Ligand binder design. Structure first.
Ligand code: HEM
Ligand code: HEM
Ligand SMILES: Cc1cc(N)nc(CCc2cc(F)cc(CC[C@@H]3C[C@H](F)CN3C)c2)c1
Ligand SMILES: Cc1cc(N)nc(CCc2cc(F)cc(CC[C@@H]3C[C@H](F)CN3C)c2)c1
Ligand SMILES: C[C@H](O)[C@H](O)[C@H]1CNc2nc(N)[nH]c(=O)c2N1
Ligand SMILES: C[C@H](O)[C@H](O)[C@H]1CNc2nc(N)[nH]c(=O)c2N1
Ligand SMILES: [Cl-]
Ligand SMILES: [Cl-]
Ligand SMILES: [Gd]
Ligand SMILES: [Zn+2]
Ligand SMILES: [Zn+2]
Lengths: 404, 404
């Protein structure tokens, strides 16, 4: 049982939940690989193992462990896999599993909200046109005219033989990225690859820096099909600053809905390669990483020039000053648009409360310090001084290979 | 089977082959990562194997591996460990071992400087009084009227028969911390323990916020003895802000010389419990950590209120704005006083150069991401997007328990 200390207050706890981890991480006594973005790289009796644990979890949480439906539901999954080699989740199990995978995500700082999650069950999906309608329902429900609500849509599970449902975009809303002889990029450099697949599959491109890409939706065994997103359905926020009048003229925008559409949801040994989930943004994601990363929109120096900052010496802290103002413009613009957003101080303080909750309830919480601490102003937030333990519990969201 | 390490800003990929030579083990397992823990860790034949590895390292660096001189040194050491249970370093080996310990320190962002280290050999020290003279000479040489120079003074090694030389103070320059009426702390709260000790040992305490502490110096098998630092030896910097003129009236100060004095230096199996070392400050250590940490001087809200920021809501980013200007004040003040200081942009850029040098020289570099990434503006610096591998090489600086 690892001892975990908070260096701001002096309080000590012990993480007993870590003792119950399975899927081993990347570290060994010889070396820690905690900072690696992808840990390492990405006969059916082991399906029954992960399923019996999950069903025991489910009846644990609804109190009804021992007797009744508990040691009843243990049998049909046994018989389902005995009969068919896989099994179907009950809808309440699918709901409970989706919430747990979120609760279990070590890199997610928004997990105080894990209990409020709307699960759309898309397991009877059959075509790519159907997926598109499901995705469009999700986006409409999640966006909710700017009053965002966490949501997940679970597409049919991976099957013995036969292909997989798959969204080729990394998120549901992505901006395009186009090159030149320059090798430079117009738009988002994170999305250069998928932008060229969209074109490779027939997308007439666009002119500028904020073109919402079309979706590539992959029904099982068939090639992807391009689906264009309705402009009515993609809520966006033009960026303005509350006091720097010229900021709006930079023409910056970002979208309302953060919806991750390329991770594999794993519940009770079943795999859902298409289960896009969405919540709402923390402002540093947009302001600091998407707009200021050198390999993203890289706008930092352009803003500093407009603020008349001394970009001729690092010790002026011109980068820090312009970055804060970009974050101020993000928070201001989303509030003025009445689009849900949370600043990194509010988010991290909520995550501390979540750590306290998870301590009482489960004896600890898997947390990835490098991802929980915000990318600006880290030590000004309470999670910086909190020691954390990182480990893998199931259900889980896992990374998966791109279908290329 | 060496870890692949990616830089996400640029797309670089390398493999850390040096990690495979890590000759001691840390707190992580495949089950769980403890990378974020502040304290991760906590006879003749194992002394011999450590000695042989270091001798091998020493003769590698002088392009004389395998020579007669190399093997005579190996056989000399084995003979000395057999006759006395220990051995003595040659002066050239001590200089090389001290530089290697800095080079090997995973939490140090200043390691581009590692080969430029002044080593004072104080292994002939006989008393606490001589120890004090050596320390004062170290402070004088390292400070160098504001043009700071990296240095380490090495006091006699641990040996069977006599107690250890120890410096009880955690740094050579520290400000007192006085518990108070309100139950509050006046001065530096990180230093209440050592402050209470000094008073026990006869120090007549002050009542200010920036009172420099005396040294408690322990000769073998002696109680610690109190030594006052001559005020003219301790170079200090009043803090002012280039454009916030009321900032100077806060009365804030910091000292020029960061000199860590409670770490143990390990070279070839030998242990030096007293070997204080010093460099120069990175500005975020002073501005962000020492002045803004809620458990330290905790000035952030006072500065924000003076700047007329809106401290009623976090979404105004008043904390970030106040902290940026505190860092500006530190950099301006130290430059104005002509005292060496490096900002976090310059320092992390030089660390990136260090990583590249080290990959060519040694096949990798041990680095603790959570300590290398600065506590403000993390993703604005290039180390943020660099994956790192943390592991323990010897020679090394290690933590040790407090002598009390
Ligand atoms: C409701 C408010 C939410 C907030 C404020 C939030 C915020 C964040 C942030 C800031 C990250 C780290 C990524 C980064 O900082 O660059 C993250 C990661 C993550 N979140 Fe949340 N999120 C929310 C909802 C959700 C939901 C609903 C789910 C799933 C059901 C989820 C699952 C995840 C996962 C799996 C990761 C890891 C991403 C990766 O490994 O690339 N989050 N979230
Ligand atoms: C010359 C300029 C130097 C700079 C700019 C520098 C910078 C730093 C910084 C910023 C940290 C982490 C402190 C923080 O929390 O912000 C650190 C840690 C450390 N430094 Fe350096 N340093 C320098 C010189 C040295 C020297 C000369 C030595 C030894 C000979 C050394 C050994 C270490 C060690 C062992 C640690 C880790 C301390 C711990 O684990 O608590 N440094 N350094
Ligand atoms: C629901 C939700 C709400 C919210 N506010 N944020 C998120 C996370 C957004 C995100 C942040 C990030 F920094 C990188 C990625 C994608 C790339 C990452 C990194 C690597 F490429 C593999 N991963 C997939 C995605 C989710
Ligand atoms: C030579 C030098 C130059 C420079 N510029 N900076 C430094 C770092 C100074 C420092 C920073 C820090 F963040 C923590 C500690 C000591 C405390 C650490 C943390 C925990 F309290 C126990 N350890 C002993 C010391 C050293
Ligand atoms: C709990 C957490 O790991 C701890 O507060 C660490 C984080 N990273 C740090 N990094 C540096 N350079 N200095 C520190 O004191 C800390 N504190
Ligand atoms: C190299 C480093 O581990 C990598 O850049 C990580 C660091 N922490 C991060 N944290 C978050 N939240 N998002 C990220 O993309 C990253 N990148
Ligand atoms: Cl994003
Ligand atoms: Cl310090
Ligand atoms: Gd002024
Ligand atoms: Zn680890
Ligand atoms: Zn701190």
């Amino acid at each position: 049982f690892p001892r975990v200390k908070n260096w701001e207050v002096g309080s000590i706890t012990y993480d007993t939940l870590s003792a119950q981890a399975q899927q081993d991480g990347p570290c060994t006594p010889r070396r820690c690989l905690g900072s690696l973005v992808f840990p390492r790289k990405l006969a059916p009796e082991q399906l029954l193992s992960q399923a019996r644990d999950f069903i025991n979890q489910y009846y644990s949480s609804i109190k009804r462990s021992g007797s009744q439906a508990h040691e009843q539901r243990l049998q049909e999954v046994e018989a389902e896999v005995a009969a068919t080699g896989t099994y179907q989740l009950r809808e309440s199990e699918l709901v409970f599993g989706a919430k747990q995978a979120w609760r279990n995500a070590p890199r997610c700082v928004g997990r105080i909200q894990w209990g409020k999650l709307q699960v759309f069950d898309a397991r009877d999906c059959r075509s790519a046109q159907e997926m598109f309608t499901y995705i469009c329902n999700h986006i409409k429900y999640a966006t909710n005219r700017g009053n965002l609500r966490s949501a997940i849509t679970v597409f049919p599970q991976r099957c013995p033989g036969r292909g997989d449902f798959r969204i080729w975009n990394s998120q549901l809303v992505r901006y395009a990225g186009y090159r030149q002889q320059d090798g430079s990029v117009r738009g988002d450099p994170a999305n250069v690859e998928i932008t060229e697949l969209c074109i490779q599959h027939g997308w007439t491109p666009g002119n500028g820096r904020f073109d919402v890409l079309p979706l590539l939706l992959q029904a099982p065994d068939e090639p992807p099909e391009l689906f264009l997103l309705p402009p009515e359905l993609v809520l966006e926020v033009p960026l303005e600053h509350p006091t720097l009048e010229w900021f709006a003229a930079l023409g910056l925008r970002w979208y309302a809905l953060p919806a991750v559409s390329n991770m594999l949801l794993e519940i009770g040994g079943l795999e859902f390669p298409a289960a896009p989930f969405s919540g709402w943004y923390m402002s540093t994601e947009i302001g600091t990483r998407n707009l200021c990363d050198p390999h993203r929109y890289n706008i930092l120096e352009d803003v500093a020039v407009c603020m008349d900052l001394d970009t001729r010496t690092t010790s002026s802290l011109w980068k820090d000053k312009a970055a804060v103002e970009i974050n101020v413009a993000v928070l201001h613009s989303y509030q003025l648009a009445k689009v849900t957003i949370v600043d990194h101080h509010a988010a991290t303080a909520s995550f501390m409360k979540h750590l306290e909750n998870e301590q009482k309830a489960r004896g600890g919480c898997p947390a990835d310090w490098a991802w929980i601490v915000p990318p600006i102003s880290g030590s000004l937030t309470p999670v910086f001084h909190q020691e954390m333990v990182n480990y893998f519990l199931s259900p889980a969201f896992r990374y998966q290979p791109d279908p290329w």
